[PDB]
Structures are given as structure tokens and as C-alpha cells.
Design a protein around this ligand. Structure first.
Ligand SMILES: CC(=O)N[C@H]1[C@@H](OP(=O)(O)OP(=O)(O)OC/C=C(/C)CC/C=C(/C)CC/C=C(/C)CC/C=C(/C)CC/C=C(/C)CC/C=C(/C)CC/C=C(/C)CCC=C(C)C)O[C@H](CO)[C@@H](O)[C@@H]1O
Length: 247
């Protein structure tokens, strides 16, 4: 009695090949009315069926959401039903259409390196370009680990700012905006049902999990992939199973 979605932030390399640099899984439980989200770090060193051990986000470049799903299932027991892929322009335009007033974000610190915008610490309303910049920043010692934290902060803010009667009343519009800028195989009745159930009768606390979990991984230098995360898959499989079954 649940729905699960593989949510991908994607972009183009200079050579034009597509890449995913943010991997999340969202599950909504229709019975218990509980929503959960997990971030899967893109640098996890994973067995990609057919291709050997590589950074897990290479599965998407090779075989799209289907191969990334199979790779998540084999390596982490994560097997989402649906997918939703968004690129830079889609993300920016989606935010600006959903929230023209801007998204209220407690910006962790001043940041501007490599994100094409200049953000100031503290509570600010960010447009699509700025919120994307906030989700992309990584040029500090925390690297991808701090980016995952800030991406989860963005998702929690979008949650708090969009689940309300003013938006659930506007679910048809919201859904049309999403399908125009998000590449997804969810049936549109499913966007409606999830929004209706969660927006009216869902628990407001959305619990989150970051994979790999603390003290289960190290950074290793790889032959052709470079900097990657070598993780204890079995320890992470058990944490994921524990996280997803009991609120
Ligand atoms: C910034 C930097 O330092 N860059 C340097 C660095 O490169 P890099 O690390 O790879 O980053 P890039 O620049 O390549 O950008 C790519 C980086 C990233 C993080 C890709 C980001 C792409 C995006 C589209 C942003 C993703 C944003 C977030 C918040 C993560 C979550 C993803 C998405 C798509 C959020 C989606 C939200 C929605 C409302 C749409 C959902 C649509 C649906 C149909 C599903 C709806 C149902 C649900 C249940 C949703 C969940 C529920 C709620 C309430 C939110 O290193 C190089 C060499 O060293 C340097 O050249 C370079 O300068």
C-alpha cells in the first residue's frame, strides 16, 4: 500500500552526455500516511550489472532509471517503482511556477563558488536559479556530504511550503507544471492521489536517511572512476530496511 519514486537531479556534461548528480528515493505510505526520503550518495562504489564496479550514478548514464533501479536493488535492496528526472532548466522553471514568491530557505552560509549565483547566509526567499545554486554548492571541506544535507533541507522546505490546502486545492495546476518540467513515468492519477492523501491526512514529519550511513564507508581512489565511496553494503541494506519499515 505504498508508492516509491526514484528522484534524479540530472545535467549534461560538456560533451553532451547526460549525468545524474543527485539521487533520492521518496516513499509514501498510504495506510500509515507516512512519507520517507533517502539520499543515495552518487559516489557509492557499486556493482553495475553487466559493467562491474563503478560509481553508482554511472548506471543512469548507461541505462537510465531502469538500470539505476536494478543497481540500487542489487547493491542496497532499494527498488523504487517509478522515476522522476529533472535537469537545471526544468528545476528552475518548476520552482518559479510553483512558488513565484520564492522559497524561504535558511541559507547555511555565504556561498558562490561554482554555482553561478551569490547567496547570503540566513533566511532568504530564493528563486529557482538561486535554490538550484544552493542545491549544487559543494566547494568546501564537506564536499558531497554537505550538499546532501542541504538538498534534504531543500526537500523539507518544499514539503513544508507546498503541503497545504492552498496547494492541494491547486493540485491539477501543480501536476501540469510538474509534468511539463519533470520527466516521469508516474501515472497522473498517482501524482493526484499522493498529493491528496499526504496534503490532507499525512504526517508532517518526513523522516530522512543518508546512504551510506555513518561509519560504514571509506573514500578510495579507483582505477577509472577516481574518488569513490567504498561502503559496507550489508550494513547499509539493514539500515535501509530498518528505516523504511518502522517510522
Ligand atoms: C557546483 C560545483 O562545485 N561544481 C563543480 C563540481 O562539479 P559537480 O560536483 O559534479 O556539480 P555540477 O556543477 O556538475 O552540477 C551538478 C550537481 C548537482 C547536485 C545536480 C543538481 C541537479 C538538479 C536538478 C538539482 C537537484 C535538487 C534537489 C533539491 C535534489 C532533489 C532533486 C529534485 C529533482 C527535487 C524535485 C522536487 C520536486 C517538487 C519535483 C518532484 C516531481 C515529482 C513528479 C515527484 C513528486 C512526489 C514526491 C513524493 C516528491 C517528494 C515530496 C516532497 C514534499 C518534496 O566539480 C567539478 C570538477 O571538480 C567542477 O567543474 C564544478 O565546477
Amino acid at each position: 500500500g505504498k508508492i516509491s519514486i526514484l528522484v534524479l537531479g540530472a545535467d549534461k556534461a560538456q560533451g553532451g552526455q547526460s549525468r545524474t548528480d543527485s539521487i533520492m528515493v521518496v516513499q509514501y505510505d498510504f495506510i500509515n500516511k507516512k512519507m520517507k526520503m533517502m539520499s543515495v550518495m552518487r559516489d557509492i562504489y557499486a556493482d553495475i550489472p553487466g559493467y562491474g564496479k563503478h560509481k553508482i550514478n554511472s548506471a543512469y548514464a548507461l541505462g537510465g532509471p531502469e538500470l539505476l533501479r536494478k543497481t540500487l536493488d542489487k547493491n542496497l535492496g532499494i527498488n523504487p517503482e517509478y522515476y522522476a528526472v529533472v535537469d537545471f532548466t526544468g528545476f528552475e522553471k518548476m520552482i518559479d511556477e510553483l512558488m513565484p514568491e520564492g522559497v524561504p530557505i535558511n541559507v547555511e552560509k555565504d556561498m558562490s563558488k561554482n554555482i553561478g549565483v551569490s547567496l547570503k547566509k540566513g533566511n532568504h526567499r530564493l528563486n529557482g536559479k538561486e535554490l538550484l545554486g544552493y542545491a549544487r554548492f559543494r566547494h568546501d571541506p564537506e564536499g558531497d556530504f554537505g550538499r546532501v544535507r542541504r538538498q534534504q533541507q531543500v526537500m523539507q522546505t518544499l514539503k513544508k511550503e507546498m503541503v497545504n490546502f492552498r496547494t492541494v486545492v491547486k493540485l491539477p495546476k501543480v501536476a501540469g507544471i510538474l509534468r511539463g518540467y519533470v520527466n516521469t513515468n508516474i501515472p497522473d492519477s498517482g501524482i493526484f492521489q499522493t498529493g491528496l492523501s499526504f496534503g490532507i491526512r499525512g504526517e508532517k514529519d518526513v523522516k530522512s536517511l543518508t546512504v551510506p550511513i555513518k561509519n560504514s564507508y571509506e573514500d578510495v581512489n579507483t582505477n577509472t572512476d577516481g574518488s569513490a565511496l567504498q561502503i559496507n553494503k550489508n550494513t547499509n541494506k539493514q539500515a535501509i530496511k530498518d528505516f523504511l519499515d518502522e517510522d
